[PDB]
Amino acid sequence: CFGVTFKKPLVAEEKTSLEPQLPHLQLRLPHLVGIIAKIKGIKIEVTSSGESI
Amino acid sequence: NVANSANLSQETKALLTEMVNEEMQGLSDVMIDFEIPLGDPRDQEQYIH
Numbered sequence: 001c002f003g004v005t006f007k008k009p010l011v012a013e014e015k016t017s018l019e020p021q022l023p024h025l026q027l028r029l030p031h032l033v034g035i036i037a038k039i040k041g042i043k044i045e046v047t048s049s050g051e052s053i
Numbered sequence: 054n055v056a057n058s059a060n061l062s063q064e065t066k067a068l069l070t071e072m073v074n075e076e077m078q079g080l081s082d083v084m085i086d087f088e089i090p091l092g093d094p095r096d097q098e099q100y101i102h
């Protein structure tokens with residue numbers, strides 16, 4: 001209109017959510033509980049010698 | 054230089070380059086990358102170069 005140009009109003013997103021990126025250390029000692037559980041049950045068997053004889 | 058000064062082991066190096074890259078990109082997202090005037094406006098050789 002005349003010399004000036006008119007532009008439409010811009011709609012705005014109401015909310016934003018922040019989810020930052022985190023470094024991944026990738027440690028291996030955690031989630032190894034099964035090995036500890038296996039260590040718990042060694043179960044060495046010893047039979048008395050001389051009771052039979 | 055930072056990796057050599059410390060004793061990074063080819064897996065914490067990637068954890069350092071990621072941080073450096075993200076920080077530098079965040080800085081670079083708001084800078085316009087222009088050139089500093091130093092000579093004379095009339096001269097044509099500098100502009101041609």
Ligand SMILES: *[C@@H]1O[C@H](CO)[C@@H](O[C@@H]2O[C@H](CO)[C@@H](O)[C@H](O)[C@H]2NC(C)=O)[C@H](O)[C@H]1NC(C)=O
Nearest residue numbers: 019020021022023024025026027028030031068
């Ligand atoms: C939290 O634990 C999850 C599951 O172990 C990790 O997600 C894995 O990440 C690796 C590396 O990117 C991928 O290869 C796997 O496919 C992912 N698994 C799943 C189920 O998503 C996640 O990385 C851990 N978070 C941190 C910060 O270490």
